[PDB]
Design a protein around this ligand. Structure first.
Ligand SMILES: N[C@@H](CCC(=O)N[C@@H](CS)C(=O)NCC(=O)O)C(=O)O
Length: 218
């Protein structure tokens, strides 16, 4: 009754997936294949032609974050994904928004860098980006293990959905962007997320993510 269109290595595809595992909503996973586009996609998401795409009642929903909020709402009876306080809720959205427009582009844009400089510059920001989210974690979690708190939340999805890749870009660049000193909470959090039940069977393997990068090469 629920169809999801994405691919094993898209962190955006992980977003509507985790959320579905939180509500216990089952779904059909319509894989896409590199370099091509299924007609069901070109059909269902004609504006961006991007994955993921949620299909619910014969209807399509687009933009991973919006799908997550829709999922939180259609299945309100289960564990709530977004926070509950109007302000707390707005915080999660600010950071998700920030992560999507600046943090991730910056971190992906690395590979494209060239002089070992720009490379550093990017990596530098990726660091500054983490120090903050380590700060946001500090208030957001109140000594609990997730942005959401005791349990997995909206901000854990958005930001956690990138761990496989960040773990992968680390390896392929001989750099560790999280460390005991500067982000000791996230280091701990990044391993209480990629192990969470709603994540552990939808989280890609760093290595597999590394073959795929080495493949997106050309
Ligand atoms: N920003 C979109 C997804 C961003 C995006 O670029 N998605 C990629 C996956 S990494 C995609 O759809 N690629 C093109 C395709 O093959 O359809 C969202 O937040 O839902």
């Amino acid at each position: 009754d629920v169809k999801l269109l994405g691919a094993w290595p898209s962190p955006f595809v992980m977003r509507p997936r985790i959320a579905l595992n939180i509500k216990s909503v089952e779904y059909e996973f319509l894989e896409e294949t590199l370099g091509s586009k299924s007609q069901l996609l070109l059909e269902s998401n004609p504006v961006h032609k991007k994955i993921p795409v949620l299909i619910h009642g014969g209807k399509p929903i687009c933009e991973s974050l919006v799908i997550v909020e829709y999922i939180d709402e259609v299945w309100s009876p289960g564990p709530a994904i977004l926070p509950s306080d109007p302000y707390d809720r707005a915080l999660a959205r600010f950071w998700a928004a920030y992560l999507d427009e600046k943090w991730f582009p910056t971190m992906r844009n690395i590979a494209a860098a060239k002089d070992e400089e720009a490379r550093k510059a990017l990596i530098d920001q990726v660091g500054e980006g983490l120090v903050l989210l380590e700060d946001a974690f500090s208030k957001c979690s109140k000594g609990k293990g997730f942005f959401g708190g005791d349990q997995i939340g909206y901000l854990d999805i958005a930001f956690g959905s990138f761990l496989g890749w960040l773990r992968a870009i680390e390896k392929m660049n001989g750099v560790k962007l999280m460390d005991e000193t500067r982000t000791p909470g996230l280091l701990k959090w990044a391993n209480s997320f990629s192990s969470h039940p709603a994540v552990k069977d939808v989280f890609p393997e760093t290595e597999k993510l590394v073959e795929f990068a080495k493949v997106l090469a050309k």
